């Protein structure tokens with residue numbers, strides 16, 4: 001079979017389709033028209049977007065296909081370098097950093113991060129308890145305050161103090177603005193064109209700002225010698241079992257920047273979409289709220305109580321199904337291969353998994369694919385392989401998966417314990433696209449159940 005292509009614009013091929021501020025959603029719409037695979041060409045590039053479990057399950061075969069750095073990720077690499085996220089599997093720092101960090105990110109390691117997560121989560125509850133009767137909550141803004149603070153604290157024992165601020169830490173304004181530049185470059189048919197000279201100068205200032213503060217953090221920590229139970233000590237002491245070598249100071253910088261990207265962008269989105277789904281599905285919110293009141297019997301949640309929030313966990317899963325906050329990943333073909341019996345690929349050939357489209361595959365999920373029903377996760381083993389991929393695939397999957405689900409489960413649990421929620425504006429979903437997806441302008445009112453901490 002020849003695969004379909006969306007509409008073209010002469011010599012620019014498909015590229016002007018990305019000239020939008022919601023490219024993932026535009027790509028989702030192309031998928032609905034064209035189906036499970038389409039070719040997408042730009043000057044000097046060709047990719048193929050997959051939306052079906054049928055084909056993505058083969059693309060997740062690690063013997064045929066490896067992680068590719070998409071143009072987006074190549075642009076993030078300018079400041080995230082060879083941290084785990086923007087490195088190639090065959091880079092020495094990939095495997096090395098991977099071997100050292102895996103035990104820091106285990107489900108086991110969560111027990112030790114738990115108390116710092118609680119620290120930030122209670123800040124959130126206390127903010128909301130202290131709001132006046134007239135006031136509402138700006139949802140993604142508060143969730144981002146939470147998740148950023150949480151990774152700051154468990155990452156290297158730094159307090160961004162986001163709940164004490166109206167405007168973001170100097171580091172974040174740079175970080176956010178750099179991610180911004182990295183994504184906007186995607187669209188420019190002619191960079192090096194002078195109209196972008198300010199953008200480039202800015203970027204360099206931003207990279208600089210991020211580097212200085214992180215390098216200073218690593219410096220101050222070594223010079224102090226203290227052994228806090230955070231990722232930075234794990235990295236400063238750790239040795240790769242394989243090579244026997246530790247990470248160098250520069251790579252450690254890259255890891256910290258990477259985790260700060262993750263903690264800002266992705267986990268906050270999950271929590272935002274979850275609360276959105278809950279207020280638009282009152283019977284579901286009530287069921288989650290009943291679980292929370294039953295399980296969270298203590299002034300503050302234990303590690304083990306969080307593991308008991310099963311329905312909360314299903315809610316997070318279903319939010320991730322409909323709106324995977326990291327919406328795509330890239331692969332290349334290790335060798336010449338035939339995809340799904342029909343599409344012959346050459347070595348080096350690129351693929352893109354369109355996760356939200358995958359999660360809409362009616363052959364997997366049934367006809368009610370658009371409905372918010374967390375119960376569809378009620379027995380996971382009934383799910384076909386590679387159907388649900390909000391965390392990526394294989395060895396290059398998200399290392400912070402367990403971190404993110406524990407944080408989210410804790411925070412949502414507490415939220416459902418402490419407040420009733422009201423969709424007071426009848427919010428119409430508007431999805432903002434950065435490196436990630438967020439519900440822009442989502443606001444609610446909370447009303448305290450007056451349960452003390």
Ligand code: HEM
Nearest residue numbers: 084085259262266267270326329391392396398399400404
């Ligand atoms: C709910 C929140 C999150 C979602 C949906 C998510 C999703 C993903 C996805 C899809 C990838 C792979 C991207 C690719 O193949 O190109 C990934 C990789 C990664 N994530 Fe996450 N992530 C989340 C939170 C976090 C957290 C909290 C951390 C840790 C601070 C983190 C650290 C990473 C790292 C380091 C990688 C690269 C792993 C490697 O290649 O060795 N993420 N994540």
Ligand SMILES: O=C(O)[C@H](Cc1ccccc1)NC(=O)[C@@H]1CCCN1C(=O)CCC1CCCCC1
Nearest residue numbers: 023024042045047070071072326327328329435
């Ligand atoms: O960055 C790319 O290479 C392509 C866009 C593209 C395709 C062909 C030609 C030029 C650009 N990326 C995409 O399809 C989508 C659309 C824009 C953003 N995007 C992404 O790749 C998402 C960026 C990251 C990837 C890893 C997990 C977190 C999110």
